[PDB]
Each structure stands twice: as structure tokens, then as C-alpha cells.
Amino acid sequence: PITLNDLSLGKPIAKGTNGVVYSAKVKYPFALKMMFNYDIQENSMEILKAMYRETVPARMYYSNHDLNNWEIELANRRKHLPPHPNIVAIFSVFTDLYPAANMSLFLLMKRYDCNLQSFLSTAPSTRTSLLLLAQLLEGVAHMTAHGIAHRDLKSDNLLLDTSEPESPILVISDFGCCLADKTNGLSLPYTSYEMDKGGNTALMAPEIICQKPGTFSVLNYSKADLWAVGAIAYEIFNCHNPFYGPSRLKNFNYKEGDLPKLPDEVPTVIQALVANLLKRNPNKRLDPEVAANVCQLFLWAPSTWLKPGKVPTSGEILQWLLSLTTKVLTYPEYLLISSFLCRAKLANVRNALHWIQENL
Amino acid sequence: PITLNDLSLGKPIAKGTNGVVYSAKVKYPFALKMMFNYDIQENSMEILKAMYRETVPARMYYSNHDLNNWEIELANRRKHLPPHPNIVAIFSVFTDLYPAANMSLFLLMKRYDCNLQSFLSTAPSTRTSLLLLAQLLEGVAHMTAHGIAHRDLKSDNLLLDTSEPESPILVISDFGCCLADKTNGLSLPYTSYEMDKGGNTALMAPEIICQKPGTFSVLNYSKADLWAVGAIAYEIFNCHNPFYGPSRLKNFNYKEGDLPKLPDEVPTVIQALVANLLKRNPNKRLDPEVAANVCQLFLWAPSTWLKPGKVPTSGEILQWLLSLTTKVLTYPEYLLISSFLCRAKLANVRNALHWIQENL
Ligand SMILES: [Mg+2]
Ligand SMILES: [Mg+2]
């Protein structure tokens, strides 16, 4: 595992009361995030959990000292997020003092070029926007499959690699608010109103913000990131996020008629996907595994699958999936497709086909 | 309108603390149900609303006295259910004193021979059972089309006319629990837990029993009767209602795998329909208009439509609809077909066709 001794620091990228991030390299394409006071004596458990949660996507953990019991209980109660192209790359996590130039938590990460709101300061291609949406969906699908909910998706913390600026790579980052517990998965008992519910923010899904507490009384997060994706899809197609600004829709109030119509430039099927994701009732929203497939099929299916027409056969689908694997053996296009083939189960690709047919 | 003076009573059919039903005739094929204490001074609104709701299917209202304001509010807030062969026939409703031998509500109805649970004490034909399911579906489609939910469908109150015992006429009865408000249709704000939710009983649909209260927080009944129809379909094909008995599935828990398999005697397409109706997620359930079409198609379509094959044409569907209208110009058979033709829209008959094809 990589520790401080193996790497050389540069300029600060960010400076704060709670921590610092430094540019870094091995012997400046890495960032070393340092969060201070990772100590049960200098902070309470809610703050420490939030620091550890940031670590959920990490590839390796390394520890100098003998683990305190809270550290052990944290580690053993946590769901791990395996690597994925659309999830932030955290190469090492380690605990260490404020020498080596406060017990501090350290995260060595890839440095990304900008966030999504900066990249969208100039309008991108309509093709670029679809690749962005597909990537986001593909990330959420990966989280949900592994019983993790981000709870704080937003333009600000989606990060991009802008080599080939016509098609960037998107990654979900900043897992500080995430739900990642082995015990309860995506269902979370909500007994007191003074409880961590994720980012208490604009893009909390209606089924979370509107739920009153009780005795199970459960919060169900299994389609909650998806709602946020819907809001963010607006930004991705050059509109205001309906739920941001001074004259502003609110997650708890909004009725589905209040949502702005998307520009005509954005395909009709995709308009519908966005309208699906933004449904108030999570039971009316697609599964993530299906919603990610809708975007992938739009992108790569035979055109006959997309026009009304249409004979669809279990054997023909498999043949098509195998045609795709060969096609990947334009780096974003490769990543998305391999991302899609990794999780493709035949049931869910038909479901997605059936959904596209019913929306024209 | 028919009032007491026009009819002659016979034996009691039922006696209770809350009211009486008498056999009756005009000058004994009618029943005159009398409910006592239809007076705000003798009963609370909850009980009166329940009494009035029993009147939702009624053909004529007649009132001796100047309506009280609570009566006025009841009437103006209520959706009316038009006549329909599979909805109980209530020819007149009138308010009257307990002389004429307590203000009492009176309902003059058709007398039916038995309820569904009695008729099924002997196993009927497999064909008879399909006729029963088709009529029940056709009732629920009629209610849902007019924004009414029964909320208390069960074997005990589905009533039959058993002339021609090979094919009986089924009617939905006992509208005391029903939702029929002009204001809110089938979407009911659910703000306190001590709220009237329909019969708080075994065949409440999962989406109703599982919903917690809040601030909109709505209860959606638009597919709830249909859930109950699924459970009842088991009884209609000689099995135990999965949700009745001592070792018993519950509406809030049951996983879709827990459901007993239906007998091999009951067609494969129909086993699927029952499985659809019993899906926990009301979005994954067919529209009532479509589900009723599935049964009708199974009964009367050209056999080419049902086997895998299969060219289905908008013009050809219309031709087949017109062939049916001529075919009805075996009284249950006539009733079902005319019931199907009255509501047949070209869109929904194709949806149903397409659904049948995908389940084989
Ligand atoms: Mg944070
Ligand atoms: Mg009653």
C-alpha cells in the first residue's frame, strides 16, 4: 500500500478549518485529502462516521497504529464500493499524525480537471450530454447494486476528466453523506427527527424529505439517488435545475405538472426517462438497473429497437450483447459499454426494451 | 320514484341491532334494507357516512323531509356509480321513519340467491370460474373508470343470480366502505393514522396497508380493488385464499414467491393475470381496463390471437369488435360481451393483446 513516504507534495488545492488537500505525486496528478482530528477524544462519533464514509470507495486501507474499537466497528459495519470508472478513484486511505511535513485521516485520490457545473458553463454537444447522463446513471446503478446510497449527488461534486473535451469521463465523488451499512442496506429506521438523513439539501428525494419519524417508519433509499439524477439531467441539457434558484421548486411540494419541458434538442425517449426519474412516488420510478439500460439502449441498440415497428428474441438479445463485447475488444464510449456489459442480465435489458416501446 | 306505499313486505331476511332487511315486492324478488338512526342526533358522522356510502350505486333518491345540511354535504361530495350488470341493483333509496308498519335509511334492491363463498362450496366448472373472474374484473373496471374504489371486496359480498347454475351473474355489493368523493377521486390525503382507510381487513392492497401518514402522503386506490381480485381469484378456482386462514399470508409482508401455484386446470395466461394482479407494486399491475380485456380476449378472441404465431391490425380489431356486436343482437355470456363492447377502446384492446403475447 502507498503511504506518505512514497509520495511528494506540491501546492495546496484546498485549505480549511477541518482539513487540507494537497496536490501530490509518487517518487502532480494525485490529491491527498487530509481531515483533522480523526480521534474519538477530539470529535464525536457522528463527525467520525462522516469522515470514514468518505472512504467507502477506497481501493486499499493501511494502518500504522493498532485499531481503536470505534475504528474496527466502523470498518466492519461498512459496505464497500468496488472500483468503477464512474466512481471517484481513491487509491489509499491511511491514518497518520499533523507532522510528516491531530491524528489525521488521509485519502490519496486522482485529481480531476473540474466539476460538472464548470464544464456546463459552456453548452456542450447534445451527444456529450447523453454520454454524461449515461455515466451518471451507470454510477448510481453501481452504488445501488451494492447497497449504497450517495444521498448528496449534485453538479458541484460530480467530477470530470476533460482529455477529449467532446466526451469527458464523469465520476461521482464526496461520499461523506453516504449510506453504506452492512446491517440495514438501503432501508434505514427513522425513529428520532434529529437523525442523519443524508445531505438535508435541495435534491433529497420526496420519499425521504416527506417521511415523518416513528417506529419503523423506515426511510427507503433504493431509488433516492435516481431522483437527484433527474434534477441534474436538466443541468446536463443546458437548463436550470428546476430545484435550484430563488424561484424554485421544492422536493416536498412540487407537483409533476410544475416541471419545465426540456428543449426539443433532447430526444423524446430521454425526456421521458427524466420525467420518470422525477416522479414523486418511488414505485412509479424505474429500477436503476433498468434506467441505466434505457440510456445504454438509446446509445447502442440497433435502430429497429428504438423505432415503433419489432420482433425481440431472447437469443437475439444475447447475440447483440456479444456483438457489443467484440466491438470493445472514444475512451468514454468503451468504459460505458463495458460498464453496461458487466451488469447486463437478460431480464433487465428486456424490461428496458419494453419501457422504451411504451414511450413514443 | 318507488316509496314504501308502493310495496308489500314479507319475511325478514336479516335482523340486527343496527337495522333489518325485509323481503318485498310491488303491489318477493326485492329486498328492502333498513338502517336505523340515520340522524346526526343519534349517530356520529363516521357511521352516517358509512350508511350513505351504501347508496353510491343507487338508481333513484327520494326524500320525504327537507334535507339537513349534513345530508346535503354528503350528497354533493359524492361520486355516483352508474348502473352496470356486475354492480348490485339498488332501485330506490329513501329516508323514512320507525313506524309505517328512528329516522331510517331504506334501500330497495334486487334479491340475489347466494354469495360467492356459498356457490363455491361445490367446485364449479373451470369455464364457470373464468366467467366469474371476467365479471368481477368488469365490475372493478366500471368502478375505476368512475373514480370509485370499493375497498372491501371479498367472497362474502360478491352476490350471485344462480338461474342457469352453469353460468351465474356476479355483482359487487355492500358499498359501505367505498371511496366515492368528487373532490379527490382515488387519491386520498392521509394525514392522521386514525383515518378511515376502507375495511381495515385482510384484502387491503399492499400500497394502502404499508403507507405511513404525513403531509401528502397520499393513498392511491387506483389499482387496489384489483389486488383483492387477485386473492379472490384463488377462491374462484377452488383454492384457499392465500390471505385467509390460520397459516396465512399477510398483505404487508408477503413476498411474491410465497404465493401458492394455481392448479394446472386454470389456463397459463390466466395464472399470469392473477400473478400480475397480486404484484406488490401497483405500477407493475395492469390497468383495470386492460386486465378486464385480458379475460375477455381469452374468452372470445380468434384463437390465432392467443397462440404465439400473429398479425394484429387496427382495422382487423375493429372488424372483430363488430363481429361481436352482431353476435349479441347463455345470458351471462351476453352481459359480459356487451359490458366489454361498451368500454372497448382500440388502444386498450391492443395493450391487452400485446400483454397476452408476452406471457406464454
Ligand atoms: Mg462532506
Ligand atoms: Mg357495512
Residue B217 with chain A: CB contacts under 8 Å: 210
Residue A190 marked ligand-binding: no
Distances from the Cα of A285 to the Cαs of A22, A199, A272, A336, in angstroms?
41, 21, 11, 22
Residue A115 marked ligand-binding: yes
For residues A109 and A7, the answer to whether their CB atoms sit within 8 Å is no
- H/E stretch holding A315 reads helix A314-327
To one decimal, the resolution in angstroms is: 2.8
A360 touches chain B (CB under 8 A): no
For residues A351 and A293, the answer to whether their CB atoms sit within 8 Å is yes
DSSP symbol at B113? S
Buried b (16+ CB within 10 A) or exposed e, A62-85: eeeeeeeeebeebeeebbebeebb
For residues A129 and A271, the answer to whether their CB atoms sit within 8 Å is no
> What is the biggest distance separating any 2 CA atoms in chain B, rounded to whole angstroms?
68
B217 touches chain A (CB under 8 A): yes
Q: Considering every ligand atom shown, identify the ligand nearest to the alpha carbon of residue A198 and give its number.
A: 1
Contacting residues for A242 by C-beta, under 8 A, at least 6 apart:
A231, A234, A248, A249, A254, A258, A259, A260
B215 touches chain A (CB under 8 A): yes
**What is the rounded distance in angstroms from the CA atom of residue B28 to the CA atom of residue B18?**
23
Q: Please give the single-letter amino acid code of residue B276.
A: N
**What is the rounded distance in angstroms from the CA atom of residue A231 to the CA atom of residue A278?**
7
**What is the rounded distance in angstroms from the CA atom of residue A309 to the CA atom of residue A299?**
18
3-state secondary structure of B7: strand
DSSP symbol at B49? H
For residues B85 and B333, the answer to whether their CB atoms sit within 8 Å is no
Q: What angle do CA B191, B178, B195 make, to 5 degrees?
A: 20
Q: Please give the single-letter amino acid code of residue B238.
A: N
- H/E stretch holding B11 reads strand B7-15
Chain A: residue whose CA lies nearest to B213: A212
**What is the rounded distance in angstroms from the CA atom of residue A154 to the CA atom of residue A244?**
11
- Among residues A57, A76, A66, the alpha carbon closest in space to that of A142 is found at A57
- Among residues B341, B347, B336, the alpha carbon closest in space to that of B290 is found at B347
| Three-class SS of B291-329 | HHHHHHHHHHCCHHHCCCCCCCCHHHHHHHHHHHHHHCC
Q: Please give the single-letter amino acid code of residue B169.
A: I
Q: Name the residue among B214, B220, B282 with its Cβ closest to that of A210.
A: B214
Kindly state the cell numbers that stand for B350.
391492443
- Among residues B199, B205, B227, the alpha carbon closest in space to that of B136 is found at B227
Q: What angle do CA B249, B295, B112 make, to 5 degrees?
A: 75
**What is the rounded distance in angstroms from the CA atom of residue A223 to the CA atom of residue A241?**
19
| Neighbour order of strands in the sheet with B30-36 | B7-15, B19-26, B30-36, B104-110, B90-96, B60-63
B207 touches chain A (CB under 8 A): yes
**What is the rounded distance in angstroms from the CA atom of residue B286 to the CA atom of residue B142?**
15
* Residues in the annotated binding site of B for ATP: 33, 110, 112, 115, 156, 174
* Residues in the annotated binding site of B for Mg(2+): 54, 157, 174
Q: Considering every ligand atom shown, identify the ligand nearest to the alpha carbon of residue B33 and give its number.
A: 2
Q: Which residue has cell 431480464? A: A347
Distance from the first to the final alpha carbon of chain A? 52
Q: Please give the single-letter amino acid code of residue A306.
A: L
- Among residues A187, A128, A123, A176, the alpha carbon closest in space to that of A154 is found at A176
Q: What angle do CA A221, A226, A227 make, to 5 degrees?
A: 90
For residues A235 and A120, the answer to whether their CB atoms sit within 8 Å is yes
Residue A331 marked ligand-binding: no
3-state secondary structure of B345: coil
**What is the rounded distance in angstroms from the CA atom of residue A259 to the CA atom of residue B65?**
50
Kindly state the cell numbers that stand for A166.
467532446
Q: Name the residue among B213, B216, B282 with its Cβ closest to that of A283.
A: B282
Residue A54 marked ligand-binding: yes
- Among residues A220, A139, A213, the alpha carbon closest in space to that of A186 is found at A220
A359 touches chain B (CB under 8 A): no
Chain A: residue whose CA lies nearest to B214: A212
After what residues is chain B interrupted, C–N > 2.5 A?
27, 97, 101, 309, 329
Cis preceding-peptide flag for A217 (omega within 30 of 0): yes
CB contact under 8 A, B207 and A283: yes
Kindly state the cell numbers that stand for A195.
437523525
Measured in Å, residue B57 CA sits from the centre of ligand 2 at 14
The length of chain A in residues reads 360
Q: How many helices (H) and strands (E) does chain B have?
A: 11, 11
Kindly state the cell numbers that stand for B354.
400485446
- H/E stretch holding A219 reads strand A218-220
Buried b (16+ CB within 10 A) or exposed e, B299-336: bbbeeebbeeeeebeeeebeebeeebeeeeeeebbebb
- Among residues A228, A250, A81, the alpha carbon closest in space to that of A155 is found at A228
For residues B138 and B130, the answer to whether their CB atoms sit within 8 Å is no
| Neighbour order of strands in the sheet with A7-15 | A7-15, A19-26, A30-35, A104-110, A90-96, A60-63
Is B96 noted as a catalytic residue in this protein?
no
Classify B147 in phi/psi space as left (phi over 0), alpha (psi -120 to 50) or beta.
Answer: left
- Among residues B169, B130, B157, B74, the alpha carbon closest in space to that of B271 is found at B130
Q: What angle do CA A294, A164, A325 make, to 5 degrees?
A: 45
- Among residues A340, A148, A135, the alpha carbon closest in space to that of A225 is found at A148
**What is the rounded distance in angstroms from the CA atom of residue A229 to the CA atom of residue A141?**
11
- H/E stretch holding B147 reads none
Beta strands B30-36 and A60-63 are unpaired
CB contact under 8 A, B213 and A211: no
For residues A356 and A297, the answer to whether their CB atoms sit within 8 Å is yes
DSSP string, A107-161: EEEE--SEEHHHHTTSPPPHHHHHHHHHHHHHHHHHHHHTT-B-S---GGGEEEE
**What is the rounded distance in angstroms from the CA atom of residue A93 to the CA atom of residue A95?**
7
Tell me what percent of chain A is helix, strand and coil, each rounded to the nearest 5: 40, 20, 45
Q: Which residue has cell 353476435? A: B327
- Among residues B201, B187, B84, the alpha carbon closest in space to that of B151 is found at B201
Q: Please give the single-letter amino acid code of residue B174.
A: D
φ and ψ at A170, to 5 degrees?
Answer: -105, 145
Contacting residues for B73 by C-beta, under 8 A, at least 6 apart:
none
Classify A262 in phi/psi space as left (phi over 0), alpha (psi -120 to 50) or beta.
Answer: beta
Q: Considering every ligand atom shown, identify the ligand nearest to the alpha carbon of residue A178 and give its number.
A: 1
- Positive or negative, the CA dihedral B177, B178, B181, B184 is positive
**What is the rounded distance in angstroms from the CA atom of residue A18 to the CA atom of residue A20?**
7
DSSP string, B160-221: EE-SSTTS-EEEE--GGG-B-BTTTTTEEE---SSS--S--STT--HHHHSPPPSSS-EEE-
For residues B174 and B51, the answer to whether their CB atoms sit within 8 Å is no
DSSP string, B221-275: -TTHHHHHHHHHHHHHTTS--TTSSSS---TTT--GGGSPPP-TTS-HHHHHHHH
Measured in Å, residue A150 CA sits from the centre of ligand 1 at 11
DSSP symbol at A187? E
Other beta carbons less than 10 A from residue A31's beta carbon: 19
Other beta carbons less than 10 A from residue A291's beta carbon: 25
Chain A: residue whose CA lies nearest to B283: A284
Sort B194 into a burial class: Cβ within 10 Å, 0-12 / 13-18 / 19+.
Answer: exposed
Contacting residues for A310 by C-beta, under 8 A, at least 6 apart:
A304, A357
Distances from the Cα of B327 to the Cαs of B194, B204, B344, B350, in angstroms?
52, 39, 16, 21
Kindly state the cell numbers that stand for B6.
308502493
**What is the rounded distance in angstroms from the CA atom of residue B120 to the CA atom of residue B133?**
13
